[PDB]
């Protein structure tokens, strides 16, 4: 009895495999047969073969999904900061307070090359660095860590140790990654979208 019931369920599961793929095939063909033409241009609009605009900016941001390290997002700043910390553990540089952090970053971000960046990204990194500044404040407060650099248990400074060279490296690498996540003009967005919806 159980054997027969179990086989009745097994064949039931079996029979759907090919039919689902038939319906998948007549999704695939009719989609790509309509959407394959769309191309992304050097001005960053998306235009039909007749040249008429469809999207003024592709994807609202001009960024290829193939670059997103985060959830549809190009970066995870926690990970990046940890990585940069590990590779360059310079012991000579001093530690910085919230004031030093903010003045150092402001000293750098004002550079024009950053101003060539999407303002939104700059504001977001501002928020990230502001949050870490607040946390380092919390830590030094909870351990009353002297900014003068004079306390005996030197270990106390290792808690949230960061250095200006590290700030420079982190910011420049963030710029690099963001810049290289852009979609390249000439790519066939329509075909990739079609296959992404189909598979």
């Amino acid at each position: 009895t159980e054997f027969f019931f179990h086989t009745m369920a097994g064949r039931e599961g079996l029979v759907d495999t090919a039919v689902k793929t038939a319906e998948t095939g007549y999704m695939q063909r009719r989609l790509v047969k309509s959407l394959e033409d769309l191309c992304s241009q050097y001005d960053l609009t998306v235009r039909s073969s007749t040249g008429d605009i469809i999207q003024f900016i592709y994807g609202g941001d001009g960024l290829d999904p193939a670059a997103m390290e985060g959830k549809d997002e190009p970066l995870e700043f926690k990970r990046v900061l940890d990585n940069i910390k590990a590779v360059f553990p310079c012991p000579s540089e001093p530690a910085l307070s919230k004031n030093e952090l903010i003045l150092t970053t402001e000293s750098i971000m004002k550079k024009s090359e950053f101003l060539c960046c999407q303002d939104s990204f700059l504001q977001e990194i501002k928020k990230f660095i502001k949050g870490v500044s607040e946390k380092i404040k919390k830590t030094r407060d909870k351990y009353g860590i002297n900014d003068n650099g004079t306390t005996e248990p030197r270990v106390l400074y290792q808690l949230d140790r960061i250095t200006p060279t590290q700030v420079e490296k982190f910011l420049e690498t963030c710029r690099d990654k963001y810049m290289r996540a852009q979609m390249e003009p000439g790519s066939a967005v329509g075909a990739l979208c079609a296959q992404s919806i189909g598979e």
Partner: protein, 209 residues
């Protein structure tokens, strides 16, 4: 009786007057902050006063730029508006020399009257609606962004930027609710302000047909 009906009349006044305000024509905040009870104080009662002209408005002059442009607001009490009523309100509009007239009907329009409402007078516009549509203002809904009508200079700037010809834009059609909401004549462009998962507002432009 028909407490809901009185509430509906209150709400149609509220919403129509908010619409006309948004369209730039003469409205004042003290009017905007009217209350249902205050409206009760103004009006009579559903059985005592009825559907006819009791609290409707025609003060809606083009306070925005030139009050000489003005709208009527008419409340034909008959469930179905016939061509003869169209003539009655046509001579109302002509006598008053008013350029616009917002019409609301209870249960719709006759074919002759429906036909006339596209050819009555090129000089005049008599936008038609039913009370049901006006019970809510579509602008308040979550599922729609804000919009703006763009002046020819701004249109020129945009089409210069990307070097387009207006026919190359995305389209919007005259029959869309928002299009009627603002009475946008075809051959124009409106800016769309799309919200986003982030503060970055998505801005985009669309041509009316």
């Amino acid at each position: 009786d028909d407490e809901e009906e009185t509430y509906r009349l209150w709400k149609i006044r509220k919403t129509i007057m908010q619409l006309c305000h948004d369209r730039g024509y003469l409205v004042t905040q003290d009017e905007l902050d009217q209350t249902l009870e205050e409206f009760k104080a103004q009006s009579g009662d559903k059985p005592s006063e009825g559907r006819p002209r009791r609290t409707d408005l025609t003060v809606l002059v083009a306070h925005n730029d030139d009050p000489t442009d003005q709208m009527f607001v008419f409340f034909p009490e008959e469930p179905k508006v016939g061509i003869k009523t169209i003539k009655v309100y046509c001579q109302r509009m002509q006598e008053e020399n008013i350029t616009r007239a917002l019409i609301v009907v209870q249960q719709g329009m006759t074919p002759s009257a429906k036909q006339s409402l596209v050819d009555m007078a090129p000089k005049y516009i008599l936008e038609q609606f039913l009370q049901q549509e006006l019970l809510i203002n579509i602008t308040e809904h979550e599922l729609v962004p804000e919009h703006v009508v763009m002046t020819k200079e701004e249109v020129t700037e945009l089409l210069a930027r990307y070097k387009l010809r207006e026919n190359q834009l995305p389209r919007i059609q005259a029959g869309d609710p928002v299009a009627r909401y603002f009475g946008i004549k075809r051959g124009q462009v409106v800016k769309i302000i799309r919200p986003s998962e982030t503060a970055g507002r998505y801005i985009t432009y669309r041509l009316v047909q």
